[PDB]
Amino acid sequence: DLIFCRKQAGVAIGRLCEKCDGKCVICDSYVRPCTLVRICDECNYGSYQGRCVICGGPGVSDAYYCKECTIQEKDRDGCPKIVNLGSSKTDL
Amino acid sequence: NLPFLKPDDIQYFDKLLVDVDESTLSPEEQKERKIMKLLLKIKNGTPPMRKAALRQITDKAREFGAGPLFNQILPLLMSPTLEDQERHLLVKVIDRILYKLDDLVRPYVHKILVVIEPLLIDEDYYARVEGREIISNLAKAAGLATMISTMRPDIDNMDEYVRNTTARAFAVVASALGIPSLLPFLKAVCKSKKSWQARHTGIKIVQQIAILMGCAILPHLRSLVEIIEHGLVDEQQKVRTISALAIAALAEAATPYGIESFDSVLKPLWKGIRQHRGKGLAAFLKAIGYLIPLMDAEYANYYTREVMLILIREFQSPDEEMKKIVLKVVKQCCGTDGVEANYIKTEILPPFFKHFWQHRMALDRRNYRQLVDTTVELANKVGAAEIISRIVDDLKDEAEQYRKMVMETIEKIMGNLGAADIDHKLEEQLIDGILYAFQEQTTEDSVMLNGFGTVVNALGKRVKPYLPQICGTVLWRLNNKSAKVRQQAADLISRTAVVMKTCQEEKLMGHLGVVLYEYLGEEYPEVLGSILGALKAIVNVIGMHKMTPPIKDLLPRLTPILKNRHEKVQENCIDLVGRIADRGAEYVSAREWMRICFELLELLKAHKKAIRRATVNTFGYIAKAIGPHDVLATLLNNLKVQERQNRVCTTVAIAIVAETCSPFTVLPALMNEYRVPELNVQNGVLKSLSFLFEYIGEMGKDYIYAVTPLLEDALMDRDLVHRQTASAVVQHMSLGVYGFGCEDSLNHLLNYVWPNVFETSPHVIQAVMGALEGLRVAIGPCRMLQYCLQGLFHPARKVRDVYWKIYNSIYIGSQDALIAHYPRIYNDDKNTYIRYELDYIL
Amino acid sequence: SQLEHLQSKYIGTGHADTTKWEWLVNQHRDSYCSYMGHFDLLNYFAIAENESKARVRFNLMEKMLQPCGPPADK
Amino acid sequence: RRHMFLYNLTLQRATGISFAIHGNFSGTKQQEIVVSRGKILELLRPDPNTGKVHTLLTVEVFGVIRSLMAFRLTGGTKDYIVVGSDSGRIVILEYQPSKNMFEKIHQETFGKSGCRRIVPGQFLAVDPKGRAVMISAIEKQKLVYILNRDAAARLTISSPLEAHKANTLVYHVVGVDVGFENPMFACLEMDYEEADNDPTGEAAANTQQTLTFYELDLGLNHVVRKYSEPLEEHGNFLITVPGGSDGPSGVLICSENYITYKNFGDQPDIRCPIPRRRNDLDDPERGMIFVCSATHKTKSMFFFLAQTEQGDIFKITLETDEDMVTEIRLKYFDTVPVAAAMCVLKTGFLFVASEFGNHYLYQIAHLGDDDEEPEFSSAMPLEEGDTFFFQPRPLKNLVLVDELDSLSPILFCQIADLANEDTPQLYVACGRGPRSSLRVLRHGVFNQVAFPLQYTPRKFVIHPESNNLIIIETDHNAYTEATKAQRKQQMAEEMVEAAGEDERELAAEMAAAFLNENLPESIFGAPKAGNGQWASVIRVMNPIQGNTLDLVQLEQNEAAFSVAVCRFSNTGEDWYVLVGVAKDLILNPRSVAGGFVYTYKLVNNGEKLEFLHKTPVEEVPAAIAPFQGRVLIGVGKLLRVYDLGKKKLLRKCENKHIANYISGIQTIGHRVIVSDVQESFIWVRYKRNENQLIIFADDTYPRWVTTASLLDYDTVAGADKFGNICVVRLPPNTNDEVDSQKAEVIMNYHVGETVLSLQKTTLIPGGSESLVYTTLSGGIGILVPFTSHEDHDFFQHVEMHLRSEHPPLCGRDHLSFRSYYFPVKNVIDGDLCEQFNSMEPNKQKNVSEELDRTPPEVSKKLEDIRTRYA
Ligand SMILES: *C[C@]1(O)C[C@@](C)(OC)O[C@H](/C=C/C(C)=C/C[C@@H]2O[C@H](C)[C@H](NC(=O)/C=C\[C@H](C)OC(C)=O)C[C@@H]2C)[C@H]1O
Ligand SMILES: [Zn+2]
Ligand SMILES: [Zn+2]
Ligand SMILES: [Zn+2]
């Protein structure tokens, strides 16, 4: 099962891979990006830096919250890096 | 159960494979087995397993002892097959168990250090970070006393690398426990009478403290300088060198503060460079060069005038490291306020350009980069033309690497300062040089492209006389046998099209556009994309009426290029078609625009957002040009005749039409499509409405009533998919019209959205809750709270569950506003529930 | 990709077993913190009474421990 | 008619101050003062030559500033400003003198918007070396940001470090001067978990305040609750004691009746009681707390300035043997009005930002250590509950250099031409307590003239014939003049009963001396009478001059809340003044014995109040409105038509169906609009034929109404306690004889300040009409109707562009801020649009051709509304 990390985000800017370029990580919408996504420091450490906040692959663009999410302050809920609770650190 | 074991994990966890009785083994063997299980669950387990095992190994750390814990952790940590994030996990484990073990780690400090400290020299930056992390946690767990006692015997070790390792470890210890904690030890060590090796190691510790801690050393900079300043006059040469290097590191860390703390060092260095030679002199000069930018104008002038003779003498030194240091020093001191521009002109520039600007330095990357940056920074203070004229002729040297160096330098200088300082003679010199450098290209240098572009764009309208020959060479290279030369020429066209327009040379521009149009059958995709970009630049500069070829011939030629699979071709051709549709749709029939629309529909689902954005823009321009009716009819037909895969493309296109030609030209026919009793057509209409409102936002404020009856029908329809999509439409409406006075229509739709709060299907109730949150935003939290208060204490537990979910969403979203909206709850016989302050009336 | 656990961890939210006393205690604590945030609300309250703003803030902070009195046992 | 579309403009910005910090914000030796007016950040510069405070910068931040501090890193020469507010974000700004603006250096996001309970923003604390800053909520959550520099000496911020603790309330947070050790933050805390699980309720009585030191370990990068000890006296705030090689580095905990030095380790707590006034006329059951503190550091000494609830400042110094403190030494410094913040500038000046009324800048003439006034110390012995004593006196160590005018608070306002100046003047009831006043404002920025008053003015009505003002001045915790003189006499006589025959000659003439001294309450403060004690008078005053044409003093514990000047149809042209007052009103918990309506006859051309009679009522008469020869009076819940009898006011008709409490009553025709304390507006129809009062319409939303103004026969504009303005309207042809109708809210807007006066008028003759409002923070603002829809669309696009390009300075969302309690509706924020001039030229030009104009045309179109005012 996948969940959200939801730790206190920091100064690191979340990234997306080429497959999801422009998508909002909360609501999956492609309409009107608005506010830069921030992620926790643990999610950006070491080889995880600059990686996709959904798959961990190479990041090519900055992740954004959509306008609807920032209106509802869904950009204030914590690090939206997706955690796979069924995997281990070196899986996939 | 037990996590999966990779082949390299067998040597470390084989004991867990044998099913022992676990009541038969030694208490020490039991300890080992439990630590092994915990480490395996941490390294190979799921996040919950890792969390639990980490918590338990931290809670049981003191019971396990530092002995067995580290005895099993250190081989795992230094495993050659260990992955980076596994190493990070083990470092976090080390940190937690150290924090809980505290002084119990003291007997094992030496062995932990000997095993881990190779991490401090690892190529991986994060490996060195984790080594320093382990050392600092060890220092704070064991205390300063035992760290010194463990690491002191290697201060005067004969092997230099042992001393370097000890110096780095002591620097990390100082960063952990604070510089004042190590100040007396360093004061004693740097002045050790017994050996110069100990003094060298202590001064190196100070240098490494500077390098590691940066600006954090500023409160103790004076103490560090006082501790090491004696080393500059030490009898041992290596001690003098390391003292100068430590001064340089402290100065770099203190930038731009702390010049006073270096006072006692100014005269030694100033004298040392008048005596020492070689690497000692190089270190002294490096220290001086890092000290100069910290001084005020007057003393900076005085001091660099005192050292400039030795600097200019070392300009001709054969040793390359000395030349690198001297280049850094000239860049630093010339960048300091107080060193006048005329002094640099007369005293520094001639020898600098005579000895440093030779074709030999362009063949090494480090020398290349450093000299380029130094020369550009020099031009920043002494003037652009003053530096450019001294190398401009070298733009025509036969050495191509030298040409590249000069071109990059001139490019950066002219991009920073412009061309206002350049006269006519140097202007023609620049033109001839960049022409020769671009013609004599064997490697397709992007530096030549950037230099040509920036030089022309900085000259501005002054390149007007040279544009004949420039465009001549551009056309020559556009017909070159190798397509990469053609791509570079088209890129140059795009880079300089604006300046070429403001020069009024439209005939050359038209011929270039004709040539580019003749190359639209280019088979190499990157070349074709660059050609399309050049054609777009030429179209933007010439205009739509006078373009050659005519637009009526250009756009139909672009129609088949839209099906190209390369993303560069796609983006460039879509942008070209878009500008044509924006400002020149006159010359294109409606049927050709419909063909373009059909080809464009598929690119709305591209993965690259730049292509999607370009497609949206161009489709909007076309819809504005041709009107909504025909394209909307085609789109509604598509909506009915196809299934999800291209249905959302059609939905996005319908929303674009509604946004560009206003929604009253789309909503009537779209809602009339809902009257078909086929259900799936109704679901398509509902999804189209959802995306339409999400896409148009504020523009939807005039259309809530228009779609209200359909939403009433869908929210009460038997199909729960209809209810879910209608709730999505309501959410997008309320969030799109937030703050535009649609409170009553949304209040009406809330009464139809609400009864679905008891739906059990997760996809349905999720959409209902999203609609409710959008309605809280658009109508306000007080109305939602008024709806909530009835079921907050309902006798039925299910009603309470539903209403408390809704209340939680409202409360998290509107905590501070609810203060004004809570109902009056009277006191009882036991508790006071009246908020008396709000009942104050002045 | 979802759950309400973090909603449960937010102070002030509730559930089907939330008591009236807890709800109103949350209301009163939120209100006191809001008064101390919105400067003109506290201005109003300090003009109504004849107390300094510091005294009003002190009183409201002291009321945060048990704003509605002791709770009931059942 | 189409719903009104309004344009909001602040004519006079708020002048109250909640926070004031001083520092080197220019980066030079000049010292400036950053103040927070609430939703406005202002930068002042006091001139050491003239001693006058000049305002350098004013910025609307469109938020609720809750915490303001200055900080600096080691080696720097300019102080950065750190702001925490209601945006869920912390911002760090740097003032730029070359462009006169607050450049936002950093903005970091951590939580939701609003003045929330568990989301940080309320408290700010900075490490004295500028290495870290803690932003704190009142409950649970605290966050620490590490601050550093880069190569170019540019400020850098880190990710937040957590330091949360459930069920923990925070009173105050202050960074500790631990030199260059690990940064430390000291907080007053209290854990309520025990109180919430003890149905007996004495785990709450046993719960005591904690002083807790949190330590930030920079190397390990975490924060730990390292120290925490309970206190005997609950503290209200903390003061940083200078540290490192500059002092002992503890904390000064201010409490009720005490100040304590505390420091973790073997340092014992040093307690010293606060010196009370000798012959203090206050209620003896009242304690004493400090309201603000200032800390000044020199090369040789460091001292603190702590002001009492009564305005007396004490200079506090600490004596130190070894590195522990030996004692706390205090001395009476001077007496200035109760302040929310005090700033000691190194040039020798003291800035006093008063909590209400005007602000002051004094010159520190003498430090006050070369006189024979007694010094007090913790070392001195007292037994029992004796607590030291001193006597206040006029200014000795300070002299007044500058006085900054401030209208805060505004409790009532009336725009009228009472001076025959053609253009109307604004007559405003400002101030609080003995420093209250009535000010007349004229357009020309407003020029002001102030007339002092006795108590806090609640309402005032203009006599149509005499044009004079009839003000009711009320105050809680206050004595009447008669009660004050009686208490003085009684305490002198009990002075000389006690003590001895040894020299009555002394005491009997000391007491006499004590009764001959009258310290002006305007400077030293009025005596606090105690709970449920009220002082109230009525004043007939001329509006051109300041002369009190008449004054009537009411009984003790009688508090005036409603006043009206009217005529009656059964009488002739005789003018009457009705004054509704409460008797024995206690606010918390609320109760009252009843009220009285005094009826006076206004004689001598509206210059004398001739007492006719007094009518008792079973509840506070909170609203009195003349109504076609009779009066409408609100007795709590009850609405009543009263007629003038010659021995009492007779109840002619009554409605008893209002929800809670009548705060206001207004009339047009036979429609009476009643404001409930909580339940918004209620429309009542008076049917004269049947002599009845029937409710026929009300609102769909609760509203804590403060004032109202009738726009037309169907439209009512109002304001609430939470800083909102509304406009509601009855549907077309709403029958006054049917049962239920609901008003439609046609306008909602969040002003950001609590509005208490709202009036439809034209401030310039020859201009159209608008809605002028005043606020408790001293602000004056206007809502201006749109004529064309072209202008409306233009200004709406301007606002929408400014929301994106010029976002609020402290991280708030402008649309959300104006939608604080209800979604914004039919109002455009002109204060935001007028920030178009404060943008950089590129932004101006970009969004100007987004409108397809030149920035000159945009700014001139903005200024044209301000000159036309409607
Ligand atoms: C993160 C992902 O979920 C990963 C993956 C593998 O998920 C299955 O791939 C996702 C990509 C999905 C794509 C590219 C779907 C195509 C959709 O196309 C329709 C027509 C929609 N297009 C637009 O909304 C287009 C333009 C909009 C209006 O404007 C902009 C600027 O985007 C949505 C999808 C793009 C991936 O997300
Ligand atoms: Zn995370
Ligand atoms: Zn991905
Ligand atoms: Zn979203």
Author numbering:
A (entry chain D): 7 to 98
B (entry chain C): 463 to 1304
C (entry chain B): 9 to 82
D (entry chain A): -2 to 441, 773 to 1198
Question: Can I see the authors' text?
Answer:
The U2 snRNP has a bipartite organization, exhibiting a smaller U2 3′ module and a larger U2 5′ module. The latter contains the heptameric SF3B complex, whose core subunit SF3B1 is recurrently mutated in cancers. In this work, by employing FR901464 analogs as molecular tools to dissect the splicing pathway, we elucidate how spliceostatins/sudemycins interfere with prespliceosome assembly and splicing commitment by covalent coupling to a reactive zinc finger of PHF5A.
We have engineered a variant of the human SF3B core that lacks the β-propeller BPB domain of SF3B3 (SF3BΔBPB). Our best orthorhombic crystals diffracted X-rays to a resolution of 2.3 Å, while diffraction data for the trigonal form was limited to ~3.0 Å. The distal half of the SSA molecule (C11-C15) establishes hydrophobic contacts and hydrogen bonds with the hinged pocket. The proximal half of SSA (atoms C1–C10) extends away from the tunnel towards one of the zinc fingers of PHF5A (i.e., Znf1). Its epoxy-tetrahydropyran group is recognized by a hydrogen bond network, involving SF3B1 and PHF5A residues and several solvent molecules in the binding pocket. Strikingly, SSA’s epoxide group resides close to C26-PHF5A—one of the four cysteine residues of PHF5A’s Znf1 zinc cluster. Notably, a thiocyanate ion replaces the water molecule at Znf1 in the orthorhombic SF3BΔBPB-crystals that grow in 200 mM potassium thiocyanate. The 2.3 Å resolution of these crystals enables visualization of thiocyanate’s distinctive elongated shape next to the zinc atom.
